[PDB]
Amino acid sequence: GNLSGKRVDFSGRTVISPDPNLSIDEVAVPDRVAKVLTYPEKVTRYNRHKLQELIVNGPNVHPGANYLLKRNEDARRNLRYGDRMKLAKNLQIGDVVERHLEDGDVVLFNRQPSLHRLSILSHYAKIRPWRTFRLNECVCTPYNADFDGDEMNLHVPQTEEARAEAINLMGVKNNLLTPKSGEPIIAATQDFITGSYLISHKDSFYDRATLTQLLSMMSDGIEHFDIPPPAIMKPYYLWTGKQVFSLLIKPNHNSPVVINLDAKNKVFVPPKSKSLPNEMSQNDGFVIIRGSQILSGVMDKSVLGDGKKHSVFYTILRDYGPQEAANAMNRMAKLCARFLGNRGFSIGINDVTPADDLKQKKEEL
Amino acid sequence: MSNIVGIEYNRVTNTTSTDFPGFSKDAENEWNVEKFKKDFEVNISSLDAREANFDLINIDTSIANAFRRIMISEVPSVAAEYVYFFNNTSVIQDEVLAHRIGLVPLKVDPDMLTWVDSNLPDDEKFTDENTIVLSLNVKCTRNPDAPKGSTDPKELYNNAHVYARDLKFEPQGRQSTTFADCPVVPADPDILLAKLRPGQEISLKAHCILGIGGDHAKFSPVSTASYRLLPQINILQPIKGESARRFQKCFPPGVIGIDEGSDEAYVKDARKDTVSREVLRYEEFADKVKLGRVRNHFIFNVESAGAMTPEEIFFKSVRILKNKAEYLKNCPITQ
């Protein structure tokens, strides 16, 4: 008899959709539910210029408002039945309007089987087309999202003090670790791993007809990059694939990001059992990063994304704050989604058939 | 970088065109309009009324993909837009039946129409040089001279199957003499839109405007606009015999040739190859064949919907891709 109980105003429940073109601290809200979920704003010296136009635009145009509350409490004046743009002209300094949900508003976001404290995070809003609560996929792992038509809940705080607590000690950028073990739980995911193994594979050598496009796809145009001198020269000017992840950690001299970790990845081969460096392996294996420069190893699940204490974004988080780790996660999440669609990756029936020798060893053994 | 490309049994390399000044130390291959005028040329395989096949050599994948991309959307065409219904008492719903009138192709020049301004009221957007009006009016009637047995709905029913030929164009407004030389008909009149029974009737009127293929699929002037790179089979270690005849039976029959009363095999008419790399899994033919395709050659193939000739669509696409380049250089850059 310890069931759900309470009924809370100003909430919605809608299905979820994929979107890695969105930042990790943002959930895109459609304009059909960001028209009835209002936010009460008191008018002051610093919002009189905006709230007049906001009242004039009305309840049907999206940058608008639905209700109005007078200072001496006349009534709760709705902006639908009469009382046109002259009502925005008086606007006494204690009036409370109920504006629409706009871009940048703090909103908390939930999934109904709440297991632990990473099931209720808090995001920024963004007003979009078609009617679904789409979100990024680096942030869907703490919600345990496996999308397939699942629904999620959305609540807006209605005061100035609870809105400050959702974004400071409850927001996404301040909760990059699970408290169960200290490991990062909210990091890179499925298609962001195989899009990183194919760039940082050793058989990848790029060119300025490709490398420039690779740097432009990860920062949607506007970012100043310093192109390093190439790893291959005078026969063919060729840039390796490990100089792309070396560049998205630290684009230019203006970013202070210096990363100096080294740890082994997933499935690993001992080099010769005599070579004292751990990175002389038969495969790529052991990863060296010295001064935001990858010297060896691929970017798989262990090094890049969810897992142990030796991640890259964990190092950016401990050394250079949460905002830079969020920027690097956004940059790789909108690099991989553009690259892997234009490289090509498929499975088929050809990659599962035994080639008539396993059919001999299976009959033998 | 390392020309005509390699087809491998598990991958394909040499994808990027990379002919820019900065691939190597020597600044090779600048823009040089007089060099591109010398290198580029066009062959033509065939020209039909609704099908065109032609070839472009020495040209990038980028600005030849651009032509393929804006053959579909940016070249405008006309289609049925607004359908007004009277007494639709058939079995097909009036959203389904209106969706099928939009998808029939119309045979008229889209240069005789002007774009609709979407800021005017509903009684002022549609004028004489803007709208093509069609009318369907079919009532089904039982045939009194019925045969000896009930066999098919074609017999014993007057006009139970409507067709695209029953969309009659109406001379609208004032300019009824401009379309008197070429009245608009559907491109193929045998389109089964509905089936009727006696007692049923369809009476409607359709307004047809101009649109691009990026807004909706029905305005796309071309059915299939695509290309293919020219394949190539470099056969070294020229060995002959029974294995050369097994080499023939893999491929399509008219793409390599055994010499009749003479020496070993060769390659004739490599244009007809659909590359399936079926000779790269044998272990008999390992260092004796080399599949590939030349990156600079393109075989443009266009089959239009029926509105216009397919040799006009390519010229209009080159004109459209030119006109959006000079429109951008004559605009001021606002900070």
Add this chain to the structure above:
Amino acid sequence: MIVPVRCFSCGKVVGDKWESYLNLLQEDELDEGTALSRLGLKRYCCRRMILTHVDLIEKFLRYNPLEK
């Protein structure tokens, strides 16, 4: 219900090739592959429109709400 006017993928008009297909099935007896090959369609797309299609409007018009 009825054959679609255009094919879904590329957009070739295949709505005019259903009555001719039924005429080639019953008289001039051929298998569906060759009779669908000497009719137009070359790719396996736009061939799927005529091959895998059920004709429900002939079964719907037996329940006419008119006179009968």
Add this chain to the structure above:
Amino acid sequence: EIALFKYRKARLEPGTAIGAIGAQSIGEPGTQMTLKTFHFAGVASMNVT
């Protein structure tokens, strides 16, 4: 400097709700128990919970 900075920030901050955190850190791995019968014995000598 790096060692003292990483040790000084590592202390438990006052006002933390660490009793509520320790209750969710145990019950949340509890909700993914598949069967997996093990044994503190040899060849299936005991069945332990």
Add this chain to the structure above:
Amino acid sequence: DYDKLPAGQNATVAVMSYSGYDIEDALVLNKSSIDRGFGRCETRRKTTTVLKRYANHTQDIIGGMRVDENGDPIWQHQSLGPDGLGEVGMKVQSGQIYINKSVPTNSADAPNPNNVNVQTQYREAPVIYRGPEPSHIDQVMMSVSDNDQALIKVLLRQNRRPELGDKFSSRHGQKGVCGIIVKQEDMPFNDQGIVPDIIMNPHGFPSRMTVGKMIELISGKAGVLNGTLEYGTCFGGSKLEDMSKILVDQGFNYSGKDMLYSGITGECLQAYIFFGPIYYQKLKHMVLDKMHARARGPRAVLTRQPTEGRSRDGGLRLGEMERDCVIAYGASQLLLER
């Protein structure tokens, strides 16, 4: 006889990673393919009223046709005929009335019948259509049911197209929501010119081990060519050996891997991509009847369609499992606010 009444669509599928809106259990869709009739559906709902004969020899009559200053009729009445019922063919948007019902206001209790004039009082109480998108009136039917009592059944149909939020199955349990409707000038085009209809993420196969779906394309793509619908029956069907023989002498790959020329850049794709047709099917559970929101007060403003059926998944509530999550944050001023 499932082949006489099928429920689904034969799509064409490029199994590849594309555009990034397909990460887990998410399909991307083609614009200019759903514009040509892929996945269109319609929803038909019944609204029934009964006209009760009360105890003191009176009825509840239907009526209407009221006008006001050249409005013929008013905005709330322009879906009704002279009888008072919705006519066939019109559309019904929000609060416009489609059945105008009026009940007597004095015949609630039983004033045992006198011959005094009291029957000239009618309190109207019609039914009012409400919803996000408008509908259409296709049938309205009068009935005279068992105890001589008038019955009105009206049907409302609504045309729907596939959008972001609508889920699709794959006849193997590969269900997934729609991610994005992509343009037709995208979606790599396999030089003959077959643009894919639905692109599927190739990561759903190792964690789920549905390799029989991989046999659906090979026995499907080689089934379209020589005009024979194939058999995929259990413990038999079409053998994989002689279906790749039909596919290899038509000019295709034996394993279904075609080489795609990319759509946004025009160059080739560095891996061969498994292409072919899959029988897809559109389910229930669309987004248009699941978007539910609430501002303040009862009778929430964004109300979904009332078809739950033993599926009460909480709703717009804040349970004790969610109360325990914000204690771990330590936010004390959000507890009082929520």
Add this chain to the structure above:
Amino acid sequence: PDREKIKLLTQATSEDGTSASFQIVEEDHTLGNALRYVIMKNPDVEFCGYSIPHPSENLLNIRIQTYGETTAVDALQKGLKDLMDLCDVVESKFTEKIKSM
């Protein structure tokens, strides 16, 4: 004269020419790739790249970054006049082959 067709973003361009960025409304991958190829054939340009930031809009952000003594507002004009010259070369060769056959 339209002033909303092409812009120049504020907190992305460096001083005195070099390393500039532009924003074009109502544009898809077509002229983006066609303009990325022509500017890359300029020996005074390092970094020319386009991107569509979000697919449900009509925006294209292009970035042009040069070596020296060539402003990126001038390498955009030089890389756009040459596309007109390419379109003049293409349609003149295609017309005479339809004509002469």
Add this chain to the structure above:
Amino acid sequence: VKTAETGYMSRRLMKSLEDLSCQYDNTVRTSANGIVQFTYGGDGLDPLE
């Protein structure tokens, strides 16, 4: 059957481990100031940091 017991153990464990917080003297106590542990974990270190 796991959905019926999706939160039964973590909610019952939440009953006692709820009103425990670290005070400003680095001691974790209950709500009635009854002290339960003099320093958290024996050393007072935040397991998140």
Add this chain to the structure above:
Amino acid sequence: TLKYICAECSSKLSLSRTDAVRCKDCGHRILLKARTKRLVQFEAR
């Protein structure tokens, strides 16, 4: 106004208020309404 249609014989009939709702030709107890004679607008997209 042409308000009724039988569901068996499909006979166009129209009776006024409270006039024993049935068919005068066969006797069928349910009656359908005809499609209206006004103009309805649709969009071919």
